[model samples]
Target: GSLRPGDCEVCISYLGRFYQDLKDRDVTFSPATIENELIKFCREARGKENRLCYYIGATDDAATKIINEVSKPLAHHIPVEKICEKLKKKDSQICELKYDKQIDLSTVDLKKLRVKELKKILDDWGETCKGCAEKSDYIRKINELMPKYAPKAASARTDL
Candidate 1:
């Protein structure tokens, strides 16, 4: 997928965080070194972030490798937002990956939510409620596993 102008929020922000983490770890700035390191970062990414890697040919699934487009600019310590501005020319789908609307565990009434939402939550956590039947079953499964995936939200919940 390719990124587009003004639509690269996810790409820019995700790479910004990646660069900063690499900086904290004292990763070298050479393009070759950074390129390989970027692949390592991609391997840990999920959802939209990982899609960026695939578009950049960073993931193993990509047939072509244009990762130098990112690695070179990154090694120069360029701002990720600026880099994404340039990257959109190469692929439009990068910008297509935007953040999804999120559920705020602090206040949302889970029981009142839809089955799709509950199912999405479980899927995102890589958990499946095989025992699910009623809507109540989904919420119960979520509560049972919340401590492992949403520790803070779990503690804040009164029902659990």
Candidate 2:
């Protein structure tokens, strides 16, 4: 698969975070040690990072198991982005997993938010406002669920 410059951003961040965590904890840098910690880290990974683990065969259901592609170089203290570059060859989807853009609930204008952004909020909440057609519909649904997902933000907007 053809690779792009920013394609590995998500992979870089996830692996970088994991690497930093192990580093700060004074963990060993051996291949087996890194692999063990990586597997443990993957078990608790959420969202796109979890998908990355699945790609590397760290998850329980993945068909392929090329995790060594990460463990070997990663154990040597290579940069996470460089390690992910090689992973792109092992599994194209590893680099394709993109992070969702963040929404600032405290300061965001709901009315100005796009339908795609609104739906992303619902996606993070594991919800589906299936009947929505207009942008207002999504906003209404999000407002209704906000108190449950974000109490502080919802309370601040209660002046409506």
Candidate 3:
């Protein structure tokens, strides 16, 4: 079938998997690790300027509510435990309430924080998935076509 419209991809971070995955290595899992990984991905992706929207766990009610408000009809869901695992591995702290999938990063207003801060937020949330690489690549592709396709939301946040 042809690709449907409004479809995006994101990794679903989990604790068990992260623990199992990194237990062998000297690395630790924490909110910082999760956030750092996300930030690194975004920075690299941003260099491509794909203008794609990615997902990260929300810190508080305000962040969660905003995500709910902006979610599409079929937004993806990622559990908090998974994020917890990733963050735990990195030896970082994060709120357990942050239990949900990050459907869209563009919905959040990033102007308030610098790129470093942004990365920290993402790391704290513990974002991950097996297909994340593919999803990110697709997002980048969409961004490259934004000028021609004209995305629905045209705000400063949208640019990020």
Candidate 4:
């Protein structure tokens, strides 16, 4: 039988949920990995012809969401332009925002602080500096959590 309108939507939904599950486990998978998994699922569930079904049936919006979810964890590892190019997203504001949210913790003075102070700071930021025996390790963990505390853009105030 031919593909129906909602067939790809169901597939995209499943993939979206799968992406969330992996993220919850701190696991990152590339878009190609997700595509391959979908292909395998289709092949097993509906034979070889539908192996490419998700790609063939996916709408631009659905593809964009899936790509965004998959690319999120790699935000710090790759350039935004490279990720957008890989995902074929010409104007992804989401990707731009992710790039903007990246933090540079080089300015933070970890060398001056004792391990106790460093651990306290990390704890305050909801991060654990445990197992960070050296100053360098503490610095690294601090940098990793810096993005979480990055300043948010100010919104317009109606009272003003």
Candidate 5:
């Protein structure tokens, strides 16, 4: 099989950045997943407006092979909100269920969270912890503000 001359270099570079972005969220996926998604995107893409093609510089079978081989898999775990945000960016009409789940911040173990993760949660609630100089301060602020949006469950007492 002959390799087609295309923007393989550029596409691979972009894919590297994409992988890093997912890694930041602790979500890893195989190169096959990325290739599969891009292929799907290419198939569904109607016009030359497809961003994948623009970045990859290939819209043929050769592109598929290159994407599959160069793309590596990693452990995949992503937050629902991040997925929704990506979808919204691609097409706003498909974001109907944007806020389907009320995030239980109280249940989250802030000590294990990264600053970026904490910032995303705060951004979603229209809150900010800019005054916090450290991750601990941010976590504390989040805990304080979370109760406002996620109230505690009522005690179960059958007596009227």
Candidate 6:
């Protein structure tokens, strides 16, 4: 196993994680003020103590920010294709060199990788995870195209 060389930034990771947490409605971690509220919340507490604290603080912060910065609200606007492109760029940039190691990209079937598979994964997650089951507009739209474009494979089987 060999490590690759590439440029990395700390603030980007911090901000990205922070923004994602905020989007997920996780109040314990705030990106604007990188406070160790997540660690604090994870500490020993009574039943629902952590959630209660998060709700109180998060709701208050949300309200205050909404009231004052309603005009200049920060929205989650990360493009899916941009994220995919960035990830691909990073993957290429961080190529691991070895004596006899080669990766196979042919196994990846981009066309077959439909929203149904993604939705199945997400729906499965929603069943177990605490997040909502409601899919994003992009996901929903992609899913709508699956039935029309993607049908059962030729080698599909009923008994699994």
- Candidates in order, TM-scores: namely 0.54, 0.54, 0.22, 0.25, 0.26, 0.18
Please report, as a residue range, the 10-residue window in candidate 1 with the lowest summed lDDT. 151-160
Please report how far candidate 3 places residue 149 from its true position, in Å. 17
Better of 1 and 5 by TM-score: 1
Quote the positional error of residue 13 for candidate 5 in Å. Answer: 65
Sort by lDDT, top down from the best? 2, 1, 5, 4, 6, 3
Least well predicted 10-residue stretch by lDDT in candidate 3: 68-77
Model 5 residue 35 distance off true place after TM-score fit, in angstroms: 64
Q: What overall lDDT goes with each candidate model?
A: 0.74, 0.75, 0.33, 0.46, 0.48, 0.35
Q: Which candidate has the top score in lDDT?
A: 2
Please, what are the lDDT tens digits per residue for candidate 1 over residues 23-139?
Answer: 787866775788887788888876678787887788879976777766776765676667777667877677767564345664767776888778877887677877777788888
Residue pairs whose backbone atoms clash in candidate 2: none
Q: Is candidate 3 or candidate 6 better by TM-score?
A: 3
Q: After superposition, how far is residue 26 of candidate 6 from its true place, in Å?
A: 7.2
Off by over 4 Å in 1: 1-6, 100-160
Give the candidates in order of TM-score, highest first. 2, 1, 5, 4, 3, 6
lDDT of 6 by residue, 49-88 (tens): 3222232233332221211121112243344123323433
Stretches off by above 4 angstroms in model 5 are 1-107, 151-160
Better of 3 and 4 by lDDT: 4
Write down the worst ten-residue block by lDDT for model 6: 63-72
Steric collisions counted per model: 9, 0, 26, 0, 7, 0
